[PDB]
Amino acid sequence: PQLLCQDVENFQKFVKEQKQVQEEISRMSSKAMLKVQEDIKALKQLLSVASSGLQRNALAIDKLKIETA
Amino acid sequence: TLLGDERDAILAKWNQLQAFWGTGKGFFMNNTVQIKQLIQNPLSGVDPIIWEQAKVDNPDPERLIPVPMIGFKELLRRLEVQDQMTKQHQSRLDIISEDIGELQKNQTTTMAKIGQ
Amino acid sequence: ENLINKWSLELEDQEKHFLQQATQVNAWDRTLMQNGERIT
């Protein structure tokens, strides 16, 4: 029976060790991923603000060119 | 004895040998013709059948190919990749924001010159 | 037969948890890709 009672312990050892990897995944929970979408949604609106500023600049540029001419 | 056999099922259950891997068999879509070269001739030990079913259920097949996920240690490595990608991601957002801010400052200066 | 019971029990439990964990990892990866697109 020693074989059986050693196989039981080694088997439960392997299983518990894999449960440890389950525990590691449990620790690994990710949230900066949730932050990435916010960062990108903000980068878009900021680039849009810059675009609006430059688009306001272009009309002044045309006015400057024509008036200087 | 069915006791030792149930124990063998428990032993192959929670394990890295993919012997009915503890119902921990789970597939992730890792972004990726060489696709059709890799996605067939199946992977490191995943069953051809479930791998084909995964390539069948994989969303964004052009934006992602199937990748074996091996237990929860692989989930851990995946979350590590996730955190690293998130770091580079907010860093790239930072680069874009710096570009936008420089644009706005120089545009303000240009506009002020326009008035002169 | 007691420890044999706890073996299968912990198996099923931690397996359900780890499956949900791989699922959360998949979701985080989906969000990472989707935000990378906007970054591009």
Numbering used by the authors:
A (entry chain I): 282 to 350
B (entry chain G): 156 to 187, 319 to 402
C (entry chain H): 359 to 398
What do the study authors state?
IR resides in the central layer of the NPC and bridges the outer rings CR and NR.
We identified 30 molecules of nine distinct nucleoporins in each IR subunit, including four copies of Nup93, six copies of Nup155, four copies of channel nucleoporin hetero-trimer (CNT, each comprising Nup62/Nup58/Nup54),13 and two copies each for Nup205, Nup188, NDC1, and ALADIN. The IR subunit displays a 2-fold symmetry, with a cytoplasmic half and a nuclear half separated along the NE. All six Nup155 molecules in the IR subunit are located on the NE side, with their β-propellers directly contacting the NE. The ALADIN–NDC1 hetero-dimer bridges the gap between Nup155-1 and Nup93-2 in the cytoplasmic half of the IR subunit.
